[PDB]
Amino acid sequence: KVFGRCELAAAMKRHGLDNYRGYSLGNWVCAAKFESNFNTQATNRNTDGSTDYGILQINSRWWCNDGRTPGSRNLCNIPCSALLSSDITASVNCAKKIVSDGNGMNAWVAWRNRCKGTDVQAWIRGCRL
Ligand SMILES: [Cl-]
Ligand SMILES: [Cl-]
Ligand SMILES: [Cl-]
Ligand SMILES: [Cl-]
Ligand SMILES: [Cl-]
Ligand SMILES: [Cl-]
Ligand SMILES: [Cl-]
Ligand SMILES: [Cl-]
Ligand SMILES: [Cl-]
Ligand code: NA
């Protein structure tokens, strides 16, 4: 599913991400934009053989099981395919664990490089929330 900007903001807010661990909704929408262009089915292979899945490009190195990432963990306790669903519940619950793990949203390199310190509120401007 390819979400609309405000549509995703609303779903994320509903699932409890607005200000989760201090990160305003705009941060999450910005991260999603640059990780996946709001596409739940997005995947990308990493140089180390791991793969990133879904709207927030969660990595099979630590967070989900795809059966093809040697020596990896599955800390969110989910198949990586669950992260491609039109229903973002699995991606959100897993993101909550990631953002809580010490480095906040810096876990998402695209957030650090493209959203961090910017006017992220612009990402939810005009949205009925
Ligand atoms: Cl899609
Ligand atoms: Cl957009
Ligand atoms: Cl915001
Ligand atoms: Cl894909
Ligand atoms: Cl993989
Ligand atoms: Cl594996
Ligand atoms: Cl594990
Ligand atoms: Cl599995
Ligand atoms: Cl933080
Ligand atoms: Na894994």
From Swiss-Prot:
A single GO CC term, please? extracellular space
Q: Where does substrate bind?
A: D101
- Disulfide cross-links: C6-C127, C30-C115, C64-C80, C76-C94
Q: Taxonomically, which superkingdom?
A: Eukaryota
BP GO annotations? cell wall macromolecule catabolic process; defense response to bacterium; defense response to Gram-negative bacterium; defense response to Gram-positive bacterium; killing of cells of another organism
* Compartments it resides in: Secreted
Query: So which tissues is this one expressed in?
Result: In the egg white and polymorphonuclear leukocytes.
Going by the UniProt record, its keywords in alphabetical order are:
Allergen, Antimicrobial, Bacteriolytic enzyme, Disulfide bond, Glycosidase, Hydrolase, Secreted, Signal
One function term, GO molecular function aspect: beta-N-acetylglucosaminidase activity
Gene3D superfamilies for this protein = 1.10.530.10
Please state what class of enzyme this protein is.
Answer: hydrolase
The UniProt record lists the EC number as 3.2.1.17
Tell me the active site.
E35, D52
Catalytic activity annotated for this protein?
A: Hydrolysis of (1->4)-beta-linkages between N-acetylmuramic acid and N-acetyl-D-glucosamine residues in a peptidoglycan and between N-acetyl-D-glucosamine residues in chitodextrins
Subunit note:
Monomer.
**PANTHER family assigned:** LYSOZYME C (PTHR11407:SF28)
Task of the protein = Lysozymes have primarily a bacteriolytic function; those in tissues and body fluids are associated with the monocyte-macrophage system and enhance the activity of immunoagents. Has bacteriolytic activity against M.luteus.
Family, according to the entry, reads as follows: Belongs to the glycosyl hydrolase 22 family.
Protein name stated in the entry: Lysozyme C
- Tell me what organism the protein belongs to: Gallus gallus
Q: Which gene encodes it?
A: LYZ
